[PDB]
Amino acid sequence: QSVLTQPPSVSAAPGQKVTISCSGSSSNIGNHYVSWYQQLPGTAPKLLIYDNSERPSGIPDRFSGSKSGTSATLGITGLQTGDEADYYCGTWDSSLSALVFGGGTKLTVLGQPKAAPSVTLFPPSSEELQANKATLVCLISDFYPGAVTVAWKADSSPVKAGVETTTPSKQSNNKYAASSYLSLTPEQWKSHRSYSCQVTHEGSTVEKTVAPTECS
Amino acid sequence: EVQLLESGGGLVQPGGSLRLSCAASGFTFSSYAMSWVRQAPGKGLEWVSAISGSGGSTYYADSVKGRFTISRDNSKNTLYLQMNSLRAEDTAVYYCARLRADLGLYMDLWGRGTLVTVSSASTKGPSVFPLAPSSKSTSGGTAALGCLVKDYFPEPVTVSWNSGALTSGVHTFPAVLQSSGLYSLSSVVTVPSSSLGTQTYICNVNHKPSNTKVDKRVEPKSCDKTH
Ligand SMILES: [Cl-]
Ligand SMILES: [Cl-]
Ligand SMILES: [Cl-]
Ligand SMILES: [Cl-]
Ligand SMILES: [Cl-]
């Protein structure tokens, strides 16, 4: 995925402080200046921090950056709901000859209780199998904060091909849901003993498993 | 004040070509290196290409070398990205960004983005498959059941349940763009397991672009002993 490593998710209540780390190597953060980009939901990224620790006009001093060795850190004090966003670190990498980014961190400003996800896994319907297709549908519901990681397993081996996953969005009850799809051929579906949808939320992984030969 | 505005985004087939522009205003365009950055829907930022103030120097991400060509016209304050041999993986919002280099390299000014969708698809109504309630859910309490609305183009579809008589516990998800070049979404509802013998559950899927409406009955599976 991305060259720089960021935590997927950080959260704290309004008025608290958080830090978001960015881990790299000599050829990127080690030898070059780190910038930070803020992406508010449904907007283009914007420059937050440049030259490791400098603020553009209009960025308040609640926002700070530092770099040491092959790591960088963004600090946010006096957290407020308007800070809720995806944050990306960036730098130059002299070894890839490329501007590189971290994978992004979703910052949640906590406004409701934390809730571990419910995970509902549907095997391919008889009807879809008879149309010669096979989709596993992993429905992930009633969680907060709105940030998950989804991994699919065929028996015990990871599957990366045929995977599509939606960005969490709010349910009527104000908690988050998200969906993930694993697209197989009927041949692939029938030729494994089981498939699993693994969801990682905060300090929990919840995994559901279905089997071609079992009534799910 | 300084601004960037991308255009040229839209639908193009695998193997096809598309050209994006960006118009700059409020500064001396020729004084600044320029950058394209993309973001597949719900994924991270990915740098694509950069170009020196003059044009005489160009840079590319490995993934786009020999397919994309960045260029600019300083007389028209315009940046271009010509994309050729497009692939499904090139599907993304493309942002133009001003690249500063005074001390470190960073992108201080961004456009609003333009979406590029790479699919061979044309108008196609959905297939609707049942997401039958788990046989382990149906013994008591509640059960999740749904509809998988698959293989349609373009967006959107709207989903109701029992012709709008059932709204509590309903969640319709955003669409994904599959490797097929077609959209899929799901709608789910939680219902009393006791009702499953005797209440009918029908998703109602409307795809106005193909004038298709599909009503799909969702029932317990044959293999489920409860039914
Ligand atoms: Cl990267
Ligand atoms: Cl669960
Ligand atoms: Cl089954
Ligand atoms: Cl200027
Ligand atoms: Cl500059």
Residue numbers in the entry:
A (entry chain LLL): 2 to 27, 27A, 27B, 28 to 95, 95A, 95B, 96 to 213
B (entry chain HHH): 1 to 52, 52A, 53 to 82, 82A, 82B, 82C, 83 to 100, 100A, ...
Please quote the paper that reports this structure:
C0020187 is a human monoclonal antibody specific for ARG2 that was derived from phage-display selections on naïve libraries of scFvs based on human Ig variable regions. We wanted to improve the affinity and potency of C0020187 to enhance its efficacy in vivo. The parental antibody, C0020187, showed inhibition to human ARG2 with an IC50 of ∼890 nM, with an inhibition curve that lies to the left of the small-molecule inhibitor NHLA (NG-hydroxy-ʟ-arginine [Millipore]).
While attempting to measure the affinity of the parental antibody, it was observed that the sensorgrams of C0020187 did not fit well to the classic 1:1 binding model, exhibiting multiphasic binding interactions and less satisfactory fits than its affinity-matured progeny. Moreover, the binding signals of the parental antibody were approximately two- to threefold lower than the affinity-matured antibodies. These observations coincided with several notable characteristics of the behavior of the parental antibody that are suggestive of negativity cooperativity on binding to trimeric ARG2. Interestingly, Fab C0020187 appeared to bind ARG2 as a tight 1:3 complex in solution, equivalent to one Fab molecule per trimer, whereas the optimized Fabs C0021158, C0021177, and C0021181 formed tight 3:3 complexes with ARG2 as would be expected if all three sites were equivalent. Taken together, these observations suggest significant negative cooperativity for the parental antibody’s interaction with trimeric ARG2, an issue that appears to have been resolved through the antibody optimization process. While this model is not able to accurately model the nonidealized three-site binding of Fab to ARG2, it should give us a reasonable measure of the initial high-affinity binding site, which would be the dominant interaction captured in the concentration range used in the BLI experiments. This analysis produced a much better fit than the 1:1 binding model, suggesting a KD value of ∼10 nM for the initial high-affinity binding site, and a substantially weaker binding interaction, which is tentatively estimated to be in the low micromolar range for the low-affinity binding sites. Even though the central hydrophobic cleft exhibits the same conformation in the parent Fab C0020187 and the affinity-matured Fabs (C0021158 and C0021181), the parent antibody does not induce the single-turn hydrophobic helix in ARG2, which is seen to fill the hydrophobic cleft between the VH and VL of the complexed affinity-matured Fabs.
